[PDB]
A paper describes a structure:
Caci_0382 is one of these genes, which encodes for a 134 amino-acid putative protein with a molecular weight of 14.3 kDa. While the exact function of Caci_0382 is not known, sequence comparison suggests that the protein belongs to the nuclear transport factor 2 (NTF2) superfamily. The three-dimensional crystal structure of Caci_0382 from Catenulispora acidiphila, described here, reveals that the protein forms a homodimer, wherein each subunit contains the NTF2 conserved structural fold with a similar binding site to LEH. The protein structure characterization suggests that the Caci_0382 structure is similar to LEH and that it shares a similar binding cavity with a conserved group of residues implicated in LEH catalytic activity.
There are two molecules per asymmetric unit and they appear to form a homodimer with the subunits related by a twofold axis in both crystal forms. Structural comparison reveals that the Caci_0382 structure in apo-form and in complex with TMA are very similar and could be aligned with an average RMSD value of 0.4 Å for individual subunits (131 Cα atoms). In the apo-form structure, well-ordered cadmium ions were identified. Two cadmium ions are bound to the surface residues H61 and H74, and one to oxygen atoms of the main chain of residue Y114 between the protein subunits. The metal ions have octahedral coordination and other ligands include chloride and acetate ions. A large cone-like cavity with an open entrance and a deep, narrow channel, going into center of the β-barrel is present in the Caci_0382 structure. Completely buried tyrosine and aspartate residues of this channel create a negative electrostatic potential on the inner surface of this pocket.
Numbering used by the authors:
A (entry chain A): 1 to 131
B (entry chain B): 2 to 131
The structure:
């Protein structure tokens, strides 16, 4: 029912145009893993850099919260991730599952899962497409 | 502490009995595999998804890394492994499974994992389909 503020902040950081708004949420040794793409970042500079890299490749990145729920230091997010890969025929929107581990307000771990096949198919890109 | 429903779900996926998976679900329960894009509703179809998976993949096994419950919601961090029949090599990948429960029954299961990692580990092309 009630969405944790950290979830709202995470979505706003991904939907905005400010890489540091994402990185600042993370611990100094915090990790970020995108399992769909297979990218791994550690620390705020690299994590803010992942928002920057994503924006460089994808226009109009936006993340909306479907629902979220906390169990102790763990937060689960069901979201929709959308955008338009620059140069691709069409945009995409897919469900995503994000698992956070937190310490107070700080994020120590973020894992993102979503269907890369669905992203590419919606986008009109080949199934084996790479940037 | 891992919920018993999580242990049961892993044992169903790791075993050789399709009905052990389906019996865990409500009559109108849903199962979505986002990596492959498959949707099933009801125990017969859900059991059938275990059968279909086993027909395509040898030694399917699911191990629990950690799991947690928030109300009627359970999150599972697991490792999903097996060997796609005919592929050069086996695979093992992390998976995130989101359950919605009612008592012991599962009303919704969503599975997420990297299909690109599955295929790459397996020695299959990136645009490989059955
Ligand atoms: Cl909730
Ligand atoms: Cl909810
Ligand atoms: Cl994924
Ligand atoms: Cl834990
Ligand atoms: Cl826990
Ligand atoms: Cl997925
Ligand atoms: Cl995927």
């Amino acid at each position: 029912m009630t969405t944790p503020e950290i979830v709202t902040a995470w979505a706003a950081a991904w939907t905005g145009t400010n890489p540091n708004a994402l990185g600042t949420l993370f611990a100094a040794d915090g990790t970020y893993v995108d399992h769909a793409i297979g990218a791994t970042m550690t620390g705020r500079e690299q994590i803010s850099g992942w928002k920057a890299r994503t924006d460089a490749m994808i226009e109009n990145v936006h993340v909306t919260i479907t629902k979220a729920y906390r169990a102790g230091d763990h937060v689960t997010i069901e979201a929709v991730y959308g955008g338009h890969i620059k140069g691709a025929p069409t945009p995409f929107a897919v469900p995503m599952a994000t698992l956070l581990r937190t310490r107070g307000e700080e994020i120590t771990s973020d894992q993102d899962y979503y269907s890369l096949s669905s992203v590419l198919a919606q986008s009109g890109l080949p199934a084996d497409w790479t940037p």
